[PDB]
């Protein structure tokens, strides 16, 4: 139903060791389609999904030119930011920007993003109305005043409501086989004796797309949370994701425990037990 | 399709 | 200035079966700043030609990377991931366990 | 069903500014019952819940003596840790320990904890079997070798299986009115125009205990996750907790959205809508 | 060495109604190291005799504290929380909003 | 009831 196109820019200064590195990656939902790395042997915008490989050399040359200009712009930004904070010339600093457009459950523009962090902390963000800004401190209000004179929110509203959703829809169509067909999790439950009277039950979800998923444990149909561990959802490397949830249980009560799986690719939520 | 070069901070 | 230490997960792309080709993954996430050293180990020794994903980050601005290499698991070959970061006093090794 | 007693120790060195500060707090589930602060005007173990206020002066003098001895022990530990890492004399460092006992859904010991962090990172932890250790690095293996010679896991197994569960059960009985009677959330939904065609729905849960809760949004009974925000669960200050979840929606579709609340104090999960 | 910046929430113990006594809360969490400065502000000015919870921490070792004071909200009195921490270049102010 | 004074690290 809902879909997103999201870009992630990272600029890292390294004084005395060259000019700042700039890396850009772009995604549709949880699938990467483009990268650019100023430190690459031959920096260029590069396809990372098959459904942008037919865009043509003109498209890719234009994305490459944008990234090269963007890297120099982020370098200027890093110099300006160091000045705002009266920071020394020798320290390394990080500038991150995330932006993009979220289509809602109707396939129309629901939310646009344009937010930035400096050295890992919120710096300035375009608000959901796409007309106002949240600035974190006095340095960010310097940036905000410059952007307001440029009608920055207006330009970003234009991109977010136009180019961003237009090309997101194009990518979604060209790759609809892999972007608009959720892949359900493949599940199983494992068992490990912990002691002479307790055991671990681990509920697995593999091979699913998109990454969003919920795994929970129940006992006699009652939620079990105090002694349940969840690992962070992790990429399998083939475009799908993995997760598991483990609970420690008194030995002999395993058959009373149920794992509950919710995922977009399932018709209804899934209930699982251990099969000895 | 990326934004067409942002303003500096 | 933020400094966050990486979370590390070592795992296979598919459930491991001896003699069946697979991929060995090391997923490092939740760290800041972005410089990080990741190696995959076979029987304690560094695997060469390991590839990794392009640097990206999460909603909370922390970075993540996937390092991976093709391998065919055997009964006795041991695998691990070794990570260094400014938050780590010595390289951190996480051993591959087939059910984690 | 399940219950825990958990202790949280923090020791912070401050070279050149006195000896390290030691703070201990103890909880049953999400309710604090004790504190000790070496920096307090008159350091003493102090009651923080009414159901330990009738334990008597002998009990409180003994807890106070333990904390004073524990503070000096953590100071020794901080000196040993600095040596293991060849760290300078002038830097400040943090030693954290969390330990305690979890009763399972049958009210028997299900898991014991004894884990520690140095400067915010895992250092050494007692494994779930209460017989083995996970040490993070070579420094932590020095600690592990000392503890193994002391039969540390055995002593901790003794406390965790005996004193910890014994006194947890006593506290649970003495305060059963407030510790064993889950308080359901009080809920409501608010509405805020964001733009001339979008609005925010915010689903509120207030006044609930224990802190564990799940809030989710649905549209036509279908999960909405891409554009939903959750705040961290937060203490109200009276022993109860608060949380909310917000979703941005196309204006006119609000009545199609449902908020779903799961909490121990509810007989069944709760479904909510906005009422205009 | 870890350095994490505090998350900040400013809110009332009960839904605010003008003229009804309440408590104003500032919850700071997720930070490391433990030293932190928190003040509640009434119309930009520091409130005295603010109390706070005893230092505790979460499963991921990050610290949290609750600062609180009794107050009776009015139509026009403005409240805020001001936080400083080693991760912050200047004190961070979060304004109280009745529906957050 | 707290643990009866731990071993040093």
Numbering used by the authors:
A (entry chain A), D (entry chain A): 1 to 276
B (entry chain C), F (entry chain C): 1 to 9
C (entry chain B), E (entry chain B): 0 to 99
What does the paper say about this structure?
In the context of the HLA-A24-B52-C12 haplotype, prevalent in Japan, the KF9 peptide (N266-274: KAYNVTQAF) is immunodominant and restricted by HLA-C*12:02. We also determine the structure of a TCR in the context of the HLA-C*12:02-KF9 complex, providing a prototype for the interaction of HLA-C with viral peptides. KF9-specific T cells are cytotoxic and suppress viral replication of both the ancestral and multiple VOC SARS-CoV-2.
We solved the first crystal structure of the HLA-C*12:02 molecule in complex with the KF9 peptide at a high resolution of 1.61 Å. The electron density was clear for the KF9 peptide in the antigen-binding cleft of HLA-C*12:02, which allowed an in-depth analysis of the peptide presentation. To better understand the selective T cell recognition of the SARS-CoV-2-derived KF9 peptide we refolded the peptide with HLA-C*12:02 and determined that the thermal stability of the complex (thermal melting temperature, Tm) was 57.63 ± 0.48 °C. The KF9 peptide docks well within HLA-C*12:02 with its anchor residues P2-Ala and P9-Phe, in addition to secondary anchor residue P6-Thr that further stabilises the peptide and interacts with the C/D pockets. As a result, P1-Lys, P4-Asn, P5-Val, P7-Gln, and P8-Ala are solvent exposed and could be contacted by TCRs. The molecular characteristics of the HLA-C*12:02 B and F pockets fit well with the peptide binding motif of the closely related allomorph HLA-C*12:03 (one residue difference, Arg97 to Trp97), showing a preference for P2-Ala and P9-Val/Tyr/Phe/Met/Ile28. In addition, as the B pocket is shallow and would favour the binding of small side-chain residues, this could suggest that the SARS-CoV-1-derived KF9 homologous peptide, with a larger P2-Gln residue, might not bind stably to HLA-C*12:02. The large P2-Gln is unfavorable for the shallow B pocket of HLA-C*12:02, and this is demonstrated by the drop of 10 °C in the pHLA complex thermal stability compared to P2-Ala SARS-CoV-2-KF9 peptide. Additionally, we compared the HLA-C*12:02-KF9 structure before and after GV37 TCR binding, and strikingly, the peptide did not change conformation (root mean square deviation [r.m.s.d.] of 0.25 Å), while the HLA-C*12:02 cleft was 1.1 Å narrower after TCR binding.
